[PDB]
């Protein structure tokens, strides 16, 4: 019976071992366990209807025993990478039924998985990123708990200085959610964009998670072009008043906001924008000015400028125009 041997090899991978007086049995045990994982990865990726009901607790148990650990202030990445892979192909499988898995993938599991985002291994955080994205898309009953617990991590990172190596990869997930949001946006989300996503531009380690943060900010305005006024005004607030090469990030974000800005809302914030933008063209840092002047290579911006030339050119070149 094949279903029995599947469970045997699963439980076999729940035995964590160590040999200090036998460096060869250790290697075999590793190789025996690395091989059993590979065998199961192939078995589940290519065979149809092999995922039966008794399997689910075995898989979640095998994942929890290997992955849910304590992160040192990993080394056996060959093994850890196979586990995430197997668990990933297990979620993606067409034989996967969330109604049965909902029993064993509870909130405690999701919580424990989020602890691992603090890990300092980019390749591990990349597997955790993908894994959490499959859970959200199939476990409707966990979508709320995840948002609440992610909204917690961010709140801890801005205010309580709870540094997190996983901020970048968490934002990347949120963008996948924001892009699929529903008709009127809930106030729960608006608050998050305003009272969480924008204050993220305030933290010092912005250099690491800025591209993904900007994506979420743009995806929010792509849905509801109502929030483009408080977004832009906040960015000019959080704008580094100190002339620094970190302005290039804001110019990037602002040009990315302008490529999707609704012209009816552009005029609502076009004056305070260019006052700052003119300051950038006058910056003592070439990279800042070079970037602000690269705005003109944007055709949709030029149209927005010429259709409002009466207000812009006075600000950009006050020597040459008046009001």
């Amino acid at each position: 019976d094949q279903e029995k041997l599947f469970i045997q090899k699963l439980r076999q991978c729940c035995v964590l071992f160590d040999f200090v007086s036998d460096p060869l049995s250790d290697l075999k045990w590793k190789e025996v366990k690395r091989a059993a994982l590979s065998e199961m990865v192939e078995y589940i990726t290519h065979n149809r209807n092999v995922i039966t009901e008794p399997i689910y607790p075995e898989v979640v148990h095998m994942f929890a025993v290997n992955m849910f650990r304590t992160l040192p202030p990993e080394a056996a990445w060959p093994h850890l990478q196979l586990v995430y892979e197997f668990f990933l192909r297990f979620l993606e499988s067409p034989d996967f039924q969330p109604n049965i898995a909902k029993k064993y993938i509870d909130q405690k599991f999701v919580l424990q998985l989020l602890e691992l985002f603090d890990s300092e291994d980019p390749r591990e955080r990349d597997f955790l990123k993908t894994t959490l994205h499959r859970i959200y898309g199939k476990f409707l009953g966990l979508r709320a708990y995840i948002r609440k617990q992610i909204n917690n991590i961010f709140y801890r990172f801005i205010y309580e200085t709870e540094h997190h190596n996983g901020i970048a990869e968490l934002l990347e997930i949120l963008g996948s959610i924001i892009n699929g949001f529903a008709l009127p946006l809930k106030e729960e989300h608006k608050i998050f964009l305003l009272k969480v996503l924008l204050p993220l531009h305030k933290v010092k380690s912005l250099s690491v998670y800025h591209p993904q943060l900007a994506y979420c900010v743009v995806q929010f305005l792509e849905k509801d072009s109502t929030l483009t006024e408080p977004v832009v005004m906040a960015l000019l607030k959080y704008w580094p008043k100190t002339h620094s090469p970190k302005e290039v990030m804001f110019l990037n974000e602002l040009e990315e906001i302008l490529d999707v800005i609704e012209p009816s809302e552009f005029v609502k914030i076009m004056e305070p924008l260019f006052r700052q933008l003119a300051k950038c063209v006058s910056s003592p840092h070439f990279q800042v000015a070079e970037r602000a002047l690269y705005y003109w290579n944007n055709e949709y911006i030029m149209s927005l400028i010429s259709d409002n030339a009466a207000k812009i050119l006075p600000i950009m070149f006050p020597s040459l125009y008046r009001n």
Partner: peptide, 12 residues
């Protein structure tokens, strides 16, 4: 960084 495909929010 993109990569991940969107998730159509629908009634929980």
């Amino acid at each position: 960084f993109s990569g991940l495909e969107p998730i159509e929010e629908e009634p929980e």
